[PDB]
Structure formats: C-alpha cells, structure tokens
Design a protein around this ligand. Structure first.
Ligand SMILES: Nc1nc2c(ncn2[C@@H]2O[C@H](COP(=O)(O)OP(=O)(O)OP(=O)(O)O)[C@@H](O)[C@H]2O)c(=O)[nH]1
Ligand SMILES: O=C([O-])C(=O)[O-]
Ligand SMILES: [Mn+2]
Ligand SMILES: [Mn+2]
Ligand code: NA
Length: 611
C-alpha cells in the first residue's frame, strides 16, 4: 500500500530479487529492524575485498603492512577482547537441554538464557542499531562447497572487518548463494551496536558496545544473534557460534560430531597414510600439530584443518572428517620459524592480522617471533604507543591473531577440500599438565576413551581447570547428553572406532623445566600412534591405559631425556586425580552422567587402588 517492507531502493550491490525467498525475508526483516542506510550483498570477489580494505584503510580502521603482499593490521578497542563467557548464551525452552543442572550449583559447562529474557535483551539492543551504516549480507559455506558434510550460513553485519575476515575464514560470495537455492541455512545476525550518530566516543576507530555485548545461540530456530563486539568469535559467526555451538546440536540431532579439533594426514616411510584428529584447548598447540614439520626422516605431515572438525560415519563405517573452515584464524604470539615454519610461510601474503605489533619497515611483530630486527628498526605495539623490550607490558595482545587462507599453507592436504572428507583412524586428546600425566597413553576401549575426554583438565592462563573434550566454552547442549552421543557411536553399523590417545606435551620437572622438547619432535609420538593403530605390540598395560614399551619410541637425536619422570605414573597422584574427577562429574553432570562414564570412573579408581 506504500513502498512498505521493500528495501530494494537501499541495495548498493546485488539484488533482493536474485536472493532465495527465505534469504530475502531474513535480509529484509532485519533491515526493517536494524535500519541500515544501505544493503550490500557480498559477491566474494577479489575486487570487493580489496576495495573494502582500502576503504577501511582510508578511514583509519586498518593499516597496510607495506613489507608484505596484500597484508593488514587492525588494532581494537581494548575492551573488545576480554572474558565474555558470561555474555555468551544459549536459548532453549528448558535449561536442562542446554546445561546439566548442577548439584551445587553453578554450571561451568554453558550458560542458558530463557526465551523471555532473550526477547527483552534483543528488543533493548537491535532496533535501529545499524542507522547510518551498511548492512553487509555474507553468504558463506562451512566446509567445501560441494560436500554433503558442509552447511551454509547467511551473516548480516555492519562491520567491514567481519566481511574481510569472513572471506578468509569461510567460503563466501555468489557461488554460495547459487549452491544454497531454496535449502536450509543458519541465520547469523551481527551488529557492533553503534548506530550513527555515535552516542559514545569511538575508541581506536573500533566500533563496539561492551556494556550491551551479548552473543546468543537459538538452536531450535537455527539462529545466531550477536551484539556489541566486533572481535573474533563474537563477530565472525561461522567459527565458534556456528561451527561449534550450533553445529554440535545439529550433530547430536543428525548423527555426527562437531568438535574443537585439528585434522592432519601423516605419511610413514613406506608411503602409508593415516588421518588423525586432535582436541586440545586454546593455547595448547592444535595449530602447531596440524601444520607440523616432522623431524623423523621419511615422515610427512599435511594439514586438513587446525581448529574445527566435523565428522560423520559413512555407510562403510569409516569416520569421515571435513574441515568446515576455509582459513586459519591462528594465535600469532609464539609462532616462529622453529615452532611453526609452515604457518610463517602461509601468512606472508593475503593475510589480515589483528592486535599484533608493527615494525617501522611495515612488518609484523609479536612475543616469541624469534626473528632479530636490524638496528634502527623500531616497533609500534598494539595500543598505538612506542614500545621497548625492557618495558613491563607486552607488545602484542597475548591472544592476537592472523587470519590466512588455508590454500596458502605449503603442506595443505591434497584432500583438504574433498567433498567426502578424510577417514579418521585416531583421535587425540590433551592439554597442559605440569605433573603426573605421561607424554602419551592409549585408552583401553571406546568407553574408556570417552571417559578420558570427559576427564580432561588444564592449567589456566596458578589454577588447574576442567575442560572436557576442549569443549567447555562451546557445548551447544547438555554435556551429559554429549557424552551419551559420543558413547552411542559404538552402537553404529560397521563403525571403525578410532583409537583414543591422550597426550601431554607440557610435563615439567621439580625446578619448572619441560621434560619433552615437543613441536617437530612430536612426530615421534605420532609414529607410536600410527603403529598402535596398525596393531604393533609396542604397548605396555598400565592402570591409566597403554603406554609405549621401553625402547618403543624413537629417541635418537634427543639427548638424555628423563624417561623415568616423563612416563612416571604415581599412585598418590592418580588417587587424587580420580577423586577430583569424581566430585566434578557428580556436581557438574549430576543426573545426566551416562552409566558408562560412572563405570569407567569406578574402574579407574579400582585399578589405582591396586597399585
Ligand atoms: N612446550 C610445548 N609447547 C607447545 C607445543 N605445541 C604448542 N605449544 C605451545 O602452545 C601455544 C600455541 O598454541 P595455540 O596456537 O595458542 O593453541 P591452539 O590449540 O591452536 O588454540 P586456538 O587457536 O585458540 O584453538 C604456545 O604457547 C606454544 O609454545 C609443544 O609441543 N610443546
Ligand atoms: O579462537 C579460538 O580458536 C579459540 O578461542 O579456541
Ligand atoms: Mn580454538
Ligand atoms: Mn589454533
Ligand atoms: Na583501530
């Protein structure tokens, strides 16, 4: 009867008429709510990308790093990279479907918000929030475009930085819209929460609204709604929100797994290849392992993904995995030629860096880069202040990131985009334990292995905290139900259940020194797993699982590594370990703890009692 709902006049790239019906309704409905000045339907092209970066550059939002081929630096408002667990929520009808109800009495395993409370929060944030801004429409695929394991999302955002970062971290643009058609998609809505004219001052040219920041997931509506943060997992909605939180629930419903894991292909000196997956928490070295440069001659490691794994059993019973991402969103500090040479090669072109330092010659810098600068070369830190090494504060944010295309990794796996995925033959769990836990062990069965994931603990970055499956920040639903879902894989037709190992790269001696060199040397641990998967009698039984036999690991080229301390298993340590695990599972999982996990707990306690 007027113009009405129709936002066609405001579209500055693409066409509302070209969009699938449901994609149009999502765009237009949110344009009516958020009141953007313009709508830009992203095409994913090189031209779109370069022009948006230059626009951000001209506005002071990013800086060009002149030392490299098409690389960039964003410095954020320091408020927009903090602990946001309290403000990261999942909405379901019943709380218990999202988190187990704890016995006493705050859950560490997720954060639920009622539908009613979320609706009020939403209405207090989104109306008018994009006034004076462009709403970008990002059509994106999580996984290779053709894969039956891939899933499609549409992200609406008012941040150009999100558009640029999503082009790297997902497959995005017109091809995705054409693959989608009338199919289902995850609705992803994001705003930085700073309508124009600005009500509060802009800090460091970085739009955000810390007071109203809220990152919400609505699995039953297939929706992610995020407000107030421009940063990382809060804004690049494909990564944690979709590919872990939403996806873990879809995976529960549909019979597959969405995990905080790397995927790698390892080939031995007789040309035999196996794929492995590994779940470690943030700051425990997934990205180092996924891109490993092995030291043992004749071995080769190739990278499928470094952070998220999606996995489903096929009709042959193979556990097929895809990497749903298109890039690596990797921790910058600590990355060097010695810790990750393949990453260093990857990130020297077409890469966006966030919150790292800049050298006077237009290069990047961070703690642990291990590269001397020429005399006269100076460094600008991440807070835009001159910085000297003798100063107390750090130069780059400790969780600062690179965002790089996966196709540029020199050891990217030839099957990293294969639509059927790669067959997983082993699953590795691990974290930072300074004491008690040996370098590597093998779980005794599937059920024991699920227990091993459930029992994971790690030093916080002193305090040791539970982080089951490295998924504590990411469960899309009740953790006890997640354990039951893992256990149910053993009831599948023809399932070839992978060997579950637990590793510890981080054990230390009584003065604080690491007992194992790690990095490329971890190839020696992977050799042992490869053979154990092959059925080699290289294993000795212990109470916690199988460990390598004396002389089973190749230790040539390493000095006198203290194997007695590194593989030591102490009754007193493991007695304490089991009681703590018992109390945690009772409190935090309570009535939803599967019978099989309580049984594995009882069995471990018993094996320890007989030492
Ligand atoms: N001692 C030792 N440290 C390691 C090893 N591998 C990685 N690290 C350390 O782990 C950290 C790097 O890992 P991150 O990239 O933060 O961990 P991630 O699992 O990729 O984390 P997200 O990307 O946040 O999921 C650095 O502190 C490294 O020193 C190893 O084999 N031995
Ligand atoms: O950003 C990440 O990958 C994380 O926090 O694990
Ligand atoms: Mn991660
Ligand atoms: Mn990583
Ligand atoms: Na900035």
């Amino acid at each position: 009867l007027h113009n009405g709902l129709d936002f066609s006049a405001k579209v500055i790239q693409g066409s509302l008429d070209s969009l699938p019906q449901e994609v149009r309704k999502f765009v237009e409905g949110n344009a009516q709510l958020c009141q953007p000045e313009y709508i830009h339907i992203c095409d994913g092209s090189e031209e779109e990308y370069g022009r948006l970066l230059a626009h951000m550059q001209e506005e002071g939002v990013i800086r060009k790093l002149k030392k490299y081929d098409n690389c960039w630096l964003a410095l954020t408002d320091p408020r927009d990279v903090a602990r946001i667990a309290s403000k990261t929520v999942i909405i379901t009808q019943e709380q218990r479907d999202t988190v187990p109800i704890p016995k006493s009495g705050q859950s560490q395993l997720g954060r639920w918000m009622s539908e009613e409370d979320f609706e009020k929060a939403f209405n207090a944030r989104f109306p008018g929030c994009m006034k004076g801004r462009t709403m970008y429409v990002i059509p994106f695929s999580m996984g290779p475009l053709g894969s039956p394991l891939a899933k499609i999302g549409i992200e609406l955002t008012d941040s150009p930085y999100v558009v640029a970062s999503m082009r790297i971290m997902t497959r995005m643009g017109t091809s995705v819209l054409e693959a989608l058609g009338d199919g289902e998609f995850i609705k992803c809505l994001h705003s930085v929460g700073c309508p124009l004219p600005l009500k509060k001052p802009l800090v460091n040219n970085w739009a955000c609204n810390p007071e109203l920041t809220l990152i919400a997931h609505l699995p039953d509506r297939r929706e992610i709604i995020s407000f107030g943060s421009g940063y990382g997992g809060n804004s690049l909605l494909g990564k944690k929100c979709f590919a872990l939180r939403i996806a873990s629930r879809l995976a529960k419903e549909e019979g597959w797994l969405a995990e905080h894991m790397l995927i790698l292909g390892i080939t031995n000196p007789e040309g035999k290849k196996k794929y492995l997956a590994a779940a470690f928490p943030s700051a425990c070295g997934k990205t180092n392992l996924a891109m490993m440069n092995p030291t043992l001659p004749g071995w080769k490691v190739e990278c499928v993904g470094d952070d998220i794994a999606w996995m489903k059993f096929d009709a042959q019973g193979n556990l097929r995995a895809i990497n749903p991402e298109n890039g690596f969103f990797g921790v910058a500090p600590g990355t060097s030629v010695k810790t990750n040479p393949n990453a260093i090669k990857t990130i020297q072109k077409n890469t966006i860096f966030t919150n790292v330092a800049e050298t006077s010659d237009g290069g990047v810098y961070w703690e642990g880069i291990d590269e001397p600068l020429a005399p006269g070369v100076t460094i600008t830190s991440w807070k835009n202040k001159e910085w000297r090494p003798q100063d107390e504060e750090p130069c780059a944010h400790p969780n600062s990131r690179f965002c790089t295309p996966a196709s540029q990794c020199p050891i990217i796996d030839p099957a990293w985009e294969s639509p059927e995925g790669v067959p997983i033959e082993g699953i590795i769990f691990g974290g930072r334990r300074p004491a008690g836990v040996p370098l590597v062990y093998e779980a005794l069965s599937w059920q024991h292995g699920v227990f091993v994931g459930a029992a994971m603990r790690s030093e916080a970055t002193k305090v040791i905290m539970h982080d089951p499956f490295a998924m504590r920040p990411f469960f899309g639903y009740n953790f006890g139900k997640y354990l039951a879902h893992w256990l149910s894989m053993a009831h599948r037709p023809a399932a070839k259940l992978p060997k579950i190992f637990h590793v510890n790269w981080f054990r230390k001696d009584k003065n604080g020194k690491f007992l194992w060199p790690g990095f490329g040397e971890n190839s020696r641990v992977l050799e042992w797993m490869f053979g154990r998967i092959e059925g080699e009698d290289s294993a000795k039984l212990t109470p916690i699982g199988y460990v390598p036999k004396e002389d089973a690991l190749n230790l040539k080229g390493l000095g006198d590594v203290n194997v007695e301390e590194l593989f030591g298993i102490s009754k007193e340590f493991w007695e304490k370990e089991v009681e703590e695990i018992d109390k945690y599972l009772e409190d935090q999982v309570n009535a939803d703890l599967p019978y099989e996990i309580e049984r594995e707990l009882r069995a471990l306690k018993q094996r320890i009692s007989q030492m």
